[PDB]
Amino acid sequence: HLKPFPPEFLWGAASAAYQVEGAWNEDGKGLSVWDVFAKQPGRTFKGTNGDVAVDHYHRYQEDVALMAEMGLKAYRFSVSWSRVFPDGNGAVNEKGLDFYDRLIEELRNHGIEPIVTLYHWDVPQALMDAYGAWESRRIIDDFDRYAVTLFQRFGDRVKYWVTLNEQNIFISFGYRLGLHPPGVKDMKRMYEANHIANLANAKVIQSFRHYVPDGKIGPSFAYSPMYPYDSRPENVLAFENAEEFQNHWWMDVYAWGMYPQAAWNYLESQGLEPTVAPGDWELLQAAKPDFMGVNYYQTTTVEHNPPDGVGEGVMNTTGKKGTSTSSGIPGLFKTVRNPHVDTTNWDWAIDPVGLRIGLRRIANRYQLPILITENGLGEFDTLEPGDIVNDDYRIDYLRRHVQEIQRAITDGVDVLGYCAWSFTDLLSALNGYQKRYGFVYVNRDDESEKDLRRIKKKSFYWYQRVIETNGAEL
Amino acid sequence: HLKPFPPEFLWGAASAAYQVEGAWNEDGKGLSVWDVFAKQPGRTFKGTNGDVAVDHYHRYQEDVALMAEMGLKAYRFSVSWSRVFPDGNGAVNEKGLDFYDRLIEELRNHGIEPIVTLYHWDVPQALMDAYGAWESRRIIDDFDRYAVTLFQRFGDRVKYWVTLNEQNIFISFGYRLGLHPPGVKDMKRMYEANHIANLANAKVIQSFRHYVPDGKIGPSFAYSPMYPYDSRPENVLAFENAEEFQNHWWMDVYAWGMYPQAAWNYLESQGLEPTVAPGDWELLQAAKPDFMGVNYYQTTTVEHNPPDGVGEGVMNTTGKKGTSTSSGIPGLFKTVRNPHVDTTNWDWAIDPVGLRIGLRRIANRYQLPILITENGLGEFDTLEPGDIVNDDYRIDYLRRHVQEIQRAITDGVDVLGYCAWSFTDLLSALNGYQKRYGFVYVNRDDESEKDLRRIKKKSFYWYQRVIETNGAEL
Numbered sequence: 001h002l003k004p005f006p007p008e009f010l011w012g013a014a015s016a017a018y019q020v021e022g023a024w025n026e027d028g029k030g031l032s033v034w035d036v037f038a039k040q041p042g043r044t045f046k047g048t049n050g051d052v053a054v055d056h057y058h059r060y061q062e063d064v065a066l067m068a069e070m071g072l073k074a075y076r077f078s079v080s081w082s083r084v085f086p087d088g089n090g091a092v093n094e095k096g097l098d099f100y101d102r103l104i105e106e107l108r109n110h111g112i113e114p115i116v117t118l119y120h121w122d123v124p125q126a127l128m129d130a131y132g133a134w135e136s137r138r139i140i141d142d143f144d145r146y147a148v149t150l151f152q153r154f155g156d157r158v159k160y161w162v163t164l165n166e167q168n169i170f171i172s173f174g175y176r177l178g179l180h181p182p183g184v185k186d187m188k189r190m191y192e193a194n195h196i197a198n199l200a201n202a203k204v205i206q207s208f209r210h211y212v213p214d215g216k217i218g219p220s221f222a223y224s225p226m227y228p229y230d231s232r233p234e235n236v237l238a239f240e241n242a243e244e245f246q247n248h249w250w251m252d253v254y255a256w257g258m259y260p261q262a263a264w265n266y267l268e269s270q271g272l273e274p275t276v277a278p279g280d281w282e283l284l285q286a287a288k289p290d291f292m293g294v295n296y297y298q299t300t301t302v303e304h305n306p307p308d309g310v311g312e313g314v315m316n317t318t319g320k321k322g323t324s325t326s327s328g329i330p331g332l333f334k335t336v337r338n339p340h341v342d343t344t345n346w347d348w349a350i351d352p353v354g355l356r357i358g359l360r361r362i363a364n365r366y367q368l369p370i371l372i373t374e375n376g377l378g379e380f381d382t383l384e385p386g387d388i389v390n391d392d393y394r395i396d397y398l399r400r401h402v403q404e405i406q407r408a409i410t411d412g413v414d415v416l417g418y419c420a421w422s423f424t425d426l427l428s429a430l431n432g433y434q435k436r437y438g439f440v441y442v443n444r445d446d447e448s449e450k451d452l453r454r455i456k457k458k459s460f461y462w463y464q465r466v467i468e469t470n471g472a473e474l
Numbered sequence: 475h476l477k478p479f480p481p482e483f484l485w486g487a488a489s490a491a492y493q494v495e496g497a498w499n500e501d502g503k504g505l506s507v508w509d510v511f512a513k514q515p516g517r518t519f520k521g522t523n524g525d526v527a528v529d530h531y532h533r534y535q536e537d538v539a540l541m542a543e544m545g546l547k548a549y550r551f552s553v554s555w556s557r558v559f560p561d562g563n564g565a566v567n568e569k570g571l572d573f574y575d576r577l578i579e580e581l582r583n584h585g586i587e588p589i590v591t592l593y594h595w596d597v598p599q600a601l602m603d604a605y606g607a608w609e610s611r612r613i614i615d616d617f618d619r620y621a622v623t624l625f626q627r628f629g630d631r632v633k634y635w636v637t638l639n640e641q642n643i644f645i646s647f648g649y650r651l652g653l654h655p656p657g658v659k660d661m662k663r664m665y666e667a668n669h670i671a672n673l674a675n676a677k678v679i680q681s682f683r684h685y686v687p688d689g690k691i692g693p694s695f696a697y698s699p700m701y702p703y704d705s706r707p708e709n710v711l712a713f714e715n716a717e718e719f720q721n722h723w724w725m726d727v728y729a730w731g732m733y734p735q736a737a738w739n740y741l742e743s744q745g746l747e748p749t750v751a752p753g754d755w756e757l758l759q760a761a762k763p764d765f766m767g768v769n770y771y772q773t774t775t776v777e778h779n780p781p782d783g784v785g786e787g788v789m790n791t792t793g794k795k796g797t798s799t800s801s802g803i804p805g806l807f808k809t810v811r812n813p814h815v816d817t818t819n820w821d822w823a824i825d826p827v828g829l830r831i832g833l834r835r836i837a838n839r840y841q842l843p844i845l846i847t848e849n850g851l852g853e854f855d856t857l858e859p860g861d862i863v864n865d866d867y868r869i870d871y872l873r874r875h876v877q878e879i880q881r882a883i884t885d886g887v888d889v890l891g892y893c894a895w896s897f898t899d900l901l902s903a904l905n906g907y908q909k910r911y912g913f914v915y916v917n918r919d920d921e922s923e924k925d926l927r928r929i930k931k932k933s934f935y936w937y938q939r940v941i942e943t944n945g946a947e948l
């Protein structure tokens with residue numbers, strides 16, 4: 001017997017400010033690092049950027065009406081820091097807060113629970129110029145001031161808050177792979193910026209307990225659970241290292257306020273461990289979250305990697321299947337194709353059982369409730385005559401993942417909700433507009449901006465029925 | 475660059491009372507459950523039992539002299555409860571305490587650290603008769619009385635203490651497989667007795683903090699780290715279940731005082747979860763150990779097991795290689811031979827890297843120091859003319875495991891010591907005398923006690939050199 005989804009289950013969908021809003025220079029908004037980064041040639045797919053995105057800043061009423069038609073119980077969005085503090089610090093921009101006030105009111109007036117995400121990668125460029133943004137401890141108080149501003153203005157109406165969305169992605173991509181701003185390839189700087197982000201996460205959670213005492217808050221982690229390739233002891237050891245280096249390194253800090261020791265010792269041997277100040281451990285250990293946010297898309301299978309072995313591999317940002325290659329850390333592990341699952345056209349593994357596994361691992365290690373803040377299928381969609389988008393492939397992916405959530409709940413995992421990525425089509429930061437995730441098709445591609453009109457996909461009606469039956473009919 | 479073994483690393487060897495002592499009915503000793511069980515027809519290999527064993531009770535001076543010749547830093551032995559309390563909970567048998575006093579004095583006069591193990595499976599039969607031994611809460615205070623008796627008598631001379639040795643074995647074999655006393659095959663009773671054993675462990679650790687404030691104490695867990703067979707999601711999920719049900723089920727309670735939730739829910743769903751009394755969780759959570767004791771011999775590889783699938787399999791107690799078959803829990807997991815490691819003639823996997831993995835897992839999950847309380851190769855030995863025993867196979871096994879301990883220490887695992895099983899040959903409870911583990915061969919077999927003479931094997935001199943070089947020459 002499978003348990004039902006709890007009556008309070010938050011059936012959601014999600015977006016991110018830079019990928020959805022547009023209005024990049026309106027109403028006093030400052031430049032974010034992504035405004036500046038995406039305009040540099042070669043940084044994004046076909047030069048696509050968020051100047052207009054899908055224009056949700058001007059069309060939020062239409063989009064929320066579509067959410068209400070679908071019956072969404074929750075909508076997770078991120079607030080653009082540079083709309084609220086165009087400088088990062090300094091004077092608050094009332095016009096920026098007013099947009100999110102109007103958005104939250106539109107959501108509440110349609111019975112949709114807002115889930116406010118504080119940070120999705122868009123620190124104001126002014127803070128990068130002033131002091132290197134996440135590489136300086138000055139960002140802890142500046143981020144805290146920004147968060148407290150939002151807590152005071154919206155805490156009366158927003159129960160659920162996410163602090164840093166995918167810190168492991170914006171840190172690793174920004175400082176190890178050089179694919180996100182600041183475009184750095186320096187592991188020492190990566191772990192320093194990462195430690196400061198950990199302190200910022202902890203500081204704002206502490207502030208949240210003061211300003212929103214009955215709210216619920218947590219970071220959201222981009223979780224690819226690791227698998228060993230097989231039972232060869234060296235491959236299981238590679239899995240132990242991969243899970244600790246890629247996943248425990250973040251979630252142990254979020255849950256326990258401690259870095260895992262083997263990873264710490266390895267980094268220390270390379271001279272890469274972060275600088276620790278007196279009080280750091282105390283602050284990190286005291287900032288217990290109400291839930292672990294989880295962005296899940298795929299598992300990763302790993303195998304042994306000799307000391308002279310694989311480092312950085314090829315990443316698929318074109319949609320040409322089979323173009324990704326193995327990446328790893330010499331001496332510890334490297335990725336390998338999992339022969340037992342299929343992949344998307346961007347070589348992302350399709351592994352719904354892996355979501356049950358990841359939920360089980362988090363509950364087993366940390367005993368935390370989980371809010372699934374992102375999950376979805378990025379794929380090409382075709383607009384057929386009659387405003388028909390037959391995205392059965394997206395329905396299939398979503399169905400199987402939701403089925404596995406129900407099994408994890410039956411296993412005893414406390415899952416608060418499920419936010420599909422994404423509500424409407426939106427900009428993929430590095431993959432352009434053709435890698436679509438929405439329930440709602442948006443009419444543009446990478447060449448032609450067209451009119452951005454909204455068209456309900458077949459998956460829209462499928463998820464409408466999911467919510468209508470509280471997940472009993474998948 | 476491997477880090478050295480720490481200077482005071484406890485190079486040890488180990489035994490257990492019923493398996494080594496003999497003198498089963500001397501000097502006032504009462505019956506243990508193993509005295510009675512092993513004399514039931516069909517319960518042990520060739521009807522072997524511990525009436526005489528290798529007669530360490532009378533020959534302990536000779537054996538300790540051999541330990542001193544080897545240069546052992548530590549000797550781990552177990553105290554026979556039925557020598558100290560012949561009826562389990564009445565008046566103390568001073569002759570019983572006096573034997574362990576003489577033993578401890580002999581060890582300390584030769585510079586060997588005693589490591590006292592309170593319980594290696596030999597609860598007095600009188601407590602089984604009176605109330606069913608571990609199945610009754612009465613055993614908590616009776617075990618506590620016995621433990622405090624030893625703490626008061628020996629706490630001045632014994633720093634390192636082990637509480638329950640392989641609770642997961644004596645409980646699961648006693649109550650699920652029916653292969654140990656009391657011969658029960660009932661999962662509900664198994665988890666009830668297990669819960670009471672957990673409370674007994676917690677109670678005596680609490681007592682230890684009062685009576686031996688400067689000592690170190692921990693339980694010892696029979697740890698077979700689980701591997702998934704491959705990266706098929708269903709097999710990784712089976713590994714998640716196997717690791718939780720077989721390993722976290724015990725070690726989470728020892729380290730955190732809490733059972734893992736997914737396993738608890740499954741047992742609850744079958745009406746198998748233990749009865750919990752007011753105060754149980756507070757006691758279990760309060761009894762933090764100084765170390766996790768680890769008895770390691772092999773890893774276990776698992777795969778998906780359907781609801782109609784494999785239950786109990788064939789267990790090899792004969793030394794005829796290849797006679798074991800898969801065991802598991804229908805719906806959760808089943809074992810499968812690991813094609814990437816060799817096995818002994820008793821079908822135990824030889825996986826030294828698995829020891830590094832297991833040590834890494836305990837440090838990663840619990841941040842506890844580890845005392846390796848047992849590790850060894852059980853194999854046939856041949857006595858060659860001139861009293862020579864060339865057990866290069868045992869040297870190879872021990873060398874490779876000690877090498878992996880050093881890698882684990884380099885990774886940052888705090889390993890306090892390493893006790894090889896066993897110092898002399900001794901009785902295997904279910905496999906007789908031919909499944910030998912000793913550094914010291916004992917001249918007897920399953921048919922005759924012969925003269926019980928002690929003969930140093932080649933591995934004796936190998937380990938002597940290991941100790942002399944503090945593990946720098948393996």
Ligand SMILES: O=P(O)(O)OC[C@H]1O[C@@H](O[C@H]2[C@H](O)[C@@H](O)[C@H](O)O[C@@H]2CO)[C@H](O)[C@@H](O)[C@@H]1O
Pocket residue numbers: 016019165166169221222223295296297374378421427428429430431435
């Ligand atoms: O738009 P994408 O690249 O297809 O990503 C989908 C959403 O997932 C998050 O980012 C990805 C990241 O880009 C990957 O490189 C990494 O491997 O995993 C995370 C998935 O957690 C972002 O939350 C979002 O902006 C993406 O749209």
Ligand SMILES: O=P(O)(O)OC[C@H]1O[C@@H](O[C@H]2[C@H](O)[C@@H](O)[C@H](O)O[C@@H]2CO)[C@H](O)[C@@H](O)[C@@H]1O
Pocket residue numbers: 490493639640643696697769770771848852895901902903904905909
């Ligand atoms: O004498 P054995 O059966 O060869 O075992 C040697 C030592 O290992 C522990 O028992 C085994 C147990 O008998 C196995 O059936 C089980 O699978 O695992 C443990 C291994 O930890 C005994 O507790 C140990 O003290 C034996 O003397």
